[PDB]
Ligand binder design. Structure first.
Ligand SMILES: CNC(=O)[C@@H](c1cccc(C)c1)N1C[C@@H](C(N)=O)CC1=O
Ligand SMILES: [Zn+2]
Length: 140
């Protein structure tokens, strides 16, 4: 589990969104595994606006932050899970690192701010849904 809290927005994995998220919906995209809802209080996270390929992510199944090198956002085939059939997920970045399904939501960050959240993994890989192209998260 986990979210990004930027401005009056809450960014979560679409497959983990709550009823309150759907009832206060700003934007969602199944192909990216992302959903954004509105919040009453202002958050403290800032979004990175960069092309970093190194950063650090939080892994809840280890209670640890790990440094990682990650690929550029791309269209990657992801195997079937209880949340989606096997399909292509867009704007996804892969790295070598530990992950388990409940690690989704952990933040990946670089020197500039939040880059994205854990969305996929297994077999010593972890995939992150990028948010750096969502420029509207910085306004409203
Ligand atoms: C092949 N299955 C997975 O990659 C697991 C998973 C497996 C291990 C670790 C993590 C973080 C997620 N996914 C991917 C998610 C998605 N975005 O489609 C839904 C899900 O359950
Ligand atoms: Zn950066």
């Amino acid at each position: 589990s986990g979210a990004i809290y930027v401005g009056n927005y809450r960014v979560v994995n679409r497959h983990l969104a709550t009823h309150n998220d759907w009832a206060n919906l700003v934007w969602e995209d199944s192909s990216r595994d992302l959903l954004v809802s509105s919040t009453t209080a202002q958050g403290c996270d800032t979004i990175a606006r960069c092309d970093c390929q190194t950063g650090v992510y939080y892994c809840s199944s280890r209670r640890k932050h790990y440094p990682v090198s990650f690929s550029k956002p791309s269209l990657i085939f992801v195997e079937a899970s209880e949340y989606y059939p096997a399909r292509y997920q867009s704007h996804l970045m892969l790295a070598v690192g530990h992950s388990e399904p409940g690690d989704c939501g952990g933040i990946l960050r670089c020197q500039h701010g939040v880059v994205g959240i854990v969305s996929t993994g297994g077999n010593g890989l972890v995939g992150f849904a990028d948010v750096r192209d969502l420029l509207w998260l910085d306004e409203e």
